[PDB]
Amino acid sequence: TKTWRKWHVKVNQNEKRYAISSAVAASGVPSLLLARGHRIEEIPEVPLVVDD
Amino acid sequence: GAYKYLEELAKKKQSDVNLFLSRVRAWEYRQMNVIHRASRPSRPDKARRLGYKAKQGYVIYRIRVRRGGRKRPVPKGQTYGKPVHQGVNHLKYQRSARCTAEERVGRYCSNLRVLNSYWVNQDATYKFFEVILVDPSHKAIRRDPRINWIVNPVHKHRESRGLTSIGKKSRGIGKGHRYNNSPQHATWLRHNTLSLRRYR
Amino acid sequence: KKQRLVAEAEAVANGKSAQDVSKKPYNVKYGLNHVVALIEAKKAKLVLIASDVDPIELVVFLPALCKKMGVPYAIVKNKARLGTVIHQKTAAVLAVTEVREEDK
Amino acid sequence: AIHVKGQLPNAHFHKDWQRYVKTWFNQPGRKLRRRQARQTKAAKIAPRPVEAIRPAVKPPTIRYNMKVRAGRGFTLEELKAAGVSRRVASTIGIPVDHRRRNRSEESLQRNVERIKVYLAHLIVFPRKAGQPKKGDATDVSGAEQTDVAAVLPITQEAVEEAKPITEEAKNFNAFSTLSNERAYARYAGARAAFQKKRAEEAEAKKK
Amino acid sequence: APGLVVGLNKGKTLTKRQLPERPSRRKGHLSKRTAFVRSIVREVAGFAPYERRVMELIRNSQDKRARKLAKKRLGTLKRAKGKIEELTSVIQSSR
RNA sequence: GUGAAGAGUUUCU
RNA sequence: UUGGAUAUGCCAUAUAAAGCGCUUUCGAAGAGUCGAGUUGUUUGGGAAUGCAGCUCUAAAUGGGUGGUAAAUUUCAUCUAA
RNA sequence: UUGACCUCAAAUCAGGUAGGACUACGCGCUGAACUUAAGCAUAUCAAUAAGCGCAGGAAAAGAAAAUAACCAUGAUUCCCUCAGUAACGGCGAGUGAAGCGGGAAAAGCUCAAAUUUGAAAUCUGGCAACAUUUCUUUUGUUGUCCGAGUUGUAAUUUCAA
Ligand SMILES: [Mg+2]
Ligand SMILES: [Mg+2]
Ligand SMILES: [Mg+2]
Ligand SMILES: [Mg+2]
Ligand SMILES: [Mg+2]
Ligand SMILES: [Mg+2]
Ligand SMILES: [Mg+2]
Ligand SMILES: [Mg+2]
Ligand SMILES: [Mg+2]
Ligand SMILES: [Mg+2]
Ligand SMILES: [Mg+2]
């Protein structure tokens, strides 16, 4: 094994931003939160926003 | 003053005066040791312009160096390789004979620092040089801001690393397109190092 | 020189400058570069060139330079004898620029 | 052996290249080191600007002479015309380039204006605190480390948005002018050598 | 100076101005003191043997032979022509 | 390097 | 630990050294080195890129560079040893 | 006869200094062949391995005898780019830089060549005193004398002048 194996992977900036946008949009969907294992059965609202 | 006259007269190496003086001095030099101390510069104007000063701590040494090429020192002309490397006779050392003069005087005066050197004479067998040396332990040198730099340990045996005037010439140190091979090994390293970035 | 300087110092406190208490010096000029300049400027009345300057090129041009400038010159024995005049071990050359009226 | 589609291979890997492989695993470390050095330097020279003011110069060659960029230092003529001695220039952060010269008034005036703007925004502290002298300032209280690029940016050259089309422009023949001008330069030497033969070999006619 | 990129006086037209004197470009000028020193040195030192040979060919009106010898001795023709002119002035200086 | 003869301003024995 | 502050409170550094400013006449500038040939080596450097040996050996607006050898004439740029 | 000067010696003379080691990185010298060319000699491997000299915390390089050919640039180094390009090459196998542009960092200078000549203005050493300290371990100051130095130590200048 050599150190100059490729360790890091480049993603296009726009695809990275697409991915984060999708991830934030998914956080607004109660079914996806429950599917991903979050115990959110009792929270009042999704998205959940608290005071400053 | 006299220095301008000495500079102009030193350019006339074919004149009757300089031819005669060269003959007698070359004979005198051949009578003493290969390396010997000079009481004073034989060329005071040349010595000053190369950094010499007439104060304690500056030393002049004279040395003669055999002229001609470098015969390959292999046993019976036998090189054990390809024909491109079978040459023995018409080969040349990459360092000047002046550089060798500095090297040998520097070993002879291992407490001193080689400052510079200049040609003084030649016959068919030898070239004669005078090597200017400085004592880094002498107080007159250590308190002098114009020569102080040479006390610092980075200047140890600068002649052995090609750092004198003739050493940098033999290394091909220069500016611009004619010296692209530059410091050779460092330049070679820059061109033969594969640069593998974190592409992320 | 030390005696002259204490005189100039004493006279520089209540009187005028060092010029008021010291006179113009009359002495032989020495130093090869200095004497060469004097010859080129036609201020040397007489130039005495030592006969045994070991790297001879230091003075080999001096008779031609003196002849060209019309300054009298002589080649004399013993750089060592010339040096004794000026309180040094040796002197390659000496020059007379000015001499007092009694020695003209 | 070669039998596949594509470019004939060219790979320069016949030396011991693995001996001199340079990796970049220290790239974020170097970036952090360099930023920390800048922060250390800024706090040390404060309130002086971290960057010295630089002249604006035109890059050489036809590929870049339409642009403007920072140069090394101000010329001796530029410093002279802005009333700054060359020995004083360095003491107040104005670099001196003894090599560059002003071949045109435009380069000179542009950089003289940069120096004048620098001097007008410059607060020189007195050498002895509380004893202001000539060329110094008496309101040093509001002194802070500021960017020179915030005050004196390098500005690219602007344009004429629109202008009338004159009858001279309408009669101009751009392509023919380019062809003629190239031909005139091309055969200047033959014309000059011809002129010698036109007026010299005729001299024998006199006698 | 048409302001084009082709032709004799091509290029953008700006306000031309006089560049200041660069003292480094004074090199090669003959100072009066240096000329005096060289005349003295030429008196003390003589002429090099090839210089005497070239002057002899000049004195015998062998102008091509002098040029061939001076170029052969000094390398280039440009240095030869300068040397032959200098030695010609010497010859006429003695006349 | 320094000197002497000889050869149809020179360098050869 | 005068690095910064009123760096106070005070040492007493501080009497003669720099800045621009008109006019002149000036303005020394590195040699067995540069350069030339040739041999070897080296370079991507091609009628020689650098280095080195040997032969020849400079100049004073001279000299170097301007990537095709040469002669001449210009121009630009630099200012070696 | 002595003395001066020059040149050259000697001393367990007074005081210093060099060598050896570490070699990852650095500056040089010297220097292969295996190998690739489907053989092989030029070429390549490689201005590499081995051999030798010499340094530092970095080294080397460095304030243009540099670029360019522009509206010009402006010490050095390093990165990206130029570019697997111009070019070299049994023009085969193979090899292969540079100017511009962007960026990191930026900093500039010292001599030799000058008559101080109404003043060698310069320097080392010894001795003494007085200070000083990472330190009784360090580092200087003054006086005096002797040496060095005019075959030139200082001072104004270094071409940008
Ligand atoms: Mg250096
Ligand atoms: Mg120079
Ligand atoms: Mg070799
Ligand atoms: Mg094979
Ligand atoms: Mg095979
Ligand atoms: Mg085989
Ligand atoms: Mg090795
Ligand atoms: Mg160490
Ligand atoms: Mg260094
Ligand atoms: Mg310079
Ligand atoms: Mg190669």
From Swiss-Prot, chain A:
The chain holds residues 105 to 156 of 363 of the full protein. The gene is rpl402. This is Large ribosomal subunit protein uL4A. It is found in: Cytoplasm; Nucleus. It comes from Schizosaccharomyces pombe (strain 972 / ATCC 24843) (Fission yeast). The eukaryote-specific C-terminal extension harbors a nuclear import signal and delivers the ACL4-uL4/RPL4 complex to the pre-ribosome, triggering uL4 release from ACL4 and incorporation into the 60S ribosomal subunit. Component of the large ribosomal subunit (LSU). Mature yeast ribosomes consist of a small (40S) and a large (60S) subunit. The 40S small subunit contains 1 molecule of ribosomal RNA (18S rRNA) and at least 33 different proteins. The large 60S subunit contains 3 rRNA molecules (25S, 5.8S and 5S rRNA) and at least 46 different proteins. uL4 is associated with the polypeptide exit tunnel. uL4 interacts with its chaperone ACL4 and the nuclear import receptor KAP104. Disulfide bonds: none annotated. There are 2 genes for uL4 in S.pombe. It comes from the Eukaryota. Belongs to the universal ribosomal protein uL4 family.
Swiss-Prot record, chain B:
It is found in: Cytoplasm; Nucleus; Nucleus, Nucleolus. One of its GO terms (cellular component) is cytosolic large ribosomal subunit. One of its GO terms (molecular function) is structural constituent of ribosome. SMART domains: Ribosomal_L15e. The modification Phosphoserine is found at residue 182. Residues 160-181 are annotated as: Disordered. The keyword Signal does not apply. Residues 168-178 have a biased composition (Basic residues). Belongs to the eukaryotic ribosomal protein eL15 family. Component of the ribosome, a large ribonucleoprotein complex responsible for the synthesis of proteins in the cell. The small ribosomal subunit (SSU) binds messenger RNAs (mRNAs) and translates the encoded message by selecting cognate aminoacyl-transfer RNA (tRNA) molecules. The large subunit (LSU) contains the ribosomal catalytic site termed the peptidyl transferase center (PTC), which catalyzes the formation of peptide bonds, thereby polymerizing the amino acids delivered by tRNAs into a polypeptide chain. This is Large ribosomal subunit protein eL15B. The gene is rpl1502.
From Swiss-Prot, chain C:
It is found in: Cytoplasm. Component of the ribosome, a large ribonucleoprotein complex responsible for the synthesis of proteins in the cell. The small ribosomal subunit (SSU) binds messenger RNAs (mRNAs) and translates the encoded message by selecting cognate aminoacyl-transfer RNA (tRNA) molecules. The large subunit (LSU) contains the ribosomal catalytic site termed the peptidyl transferase center (PTC), which catalyzes the formation of peptide bonds, thereby polymerizing the amino acids delivered by tRNAs into a polypeptide chain. This is Large ribosomal subunit protein eL8. The chain holds residues 105 to 208 of 259 of the full protein. Component of the large ribosomal subunit (LSU). Mature yeast ribosomes consist of a small (40S) and a large (60S) subunit. The 40S small subunit contains 1 molecule of ribosomal RNA (18S rRNA) and at least 33 different proteins. The large 60S subunit contains 3 rRNA molecules (25S, 5.8S and 5S rRNA) and at least 46 different proteins. It comes from Schizosaccharomyces pombe (strain 972 / ATCC 24843). The gene is rpl8. Transmembrane segments: none annotated. Belongs to the eukaryotic ribosomal protein eL8 family.
Swiss-Prot record, chain E:
It comes from the Eukaryota. GO terms for biological process: cytoplasmic translation. Residues 1-31 are annotated as: Disordered. Gene3D superfamilies: 60S ribosomal protein L36 (1.10.10.1760). One of its GO terms (molecular function) is structural constituent of ribosome. GO terms for cellular component: cytosol; cytosolic large ribosomal subunit; preribosome. It is found in: Cytoplasm. Pfam families: Ribosomal_L36e. Keywords: Cytoplasm, Ribonucleoprotein, Ribosomal protein. Belongs to the eukaryotic ribosomal protein eL36 family. PANTHER family: 60S RIBOSOMAL PROTEIN L36 (PTHR10114). Component of the ribosome, a large ribonucleoprotein complex responsible for the synthesis of proteins in the cell. The small ribosomal subunit (SSU) binds messenger RNAs (mRNAs) and translates the encoded message by selecting cognate aminoacyl-transfer RNA (tRNA) molecules. The large subunit (LSU) contains the ribosomal catalytic site termed the peptidyl transferase center (PTC), which catalyzes the formation of peptide bonds, thereby polymerizing the amino acids delivered by tRNAs into a polypeptide chain. There are 2 genes for eL36 in S.pombe. Component of the large ribosomal subunit (LSU). Mature yeast ribosomes consist of a small (40S) and a large (60S) subunit. The 40S small subunit contains 1 molecule of ribosomal RNA (18S rRNA) and at least 33 different proteins. The large 60S subunit contains 3 rRNA molecules (25S, 5.8S and 5S rRNA) and at least 46 different proteins.
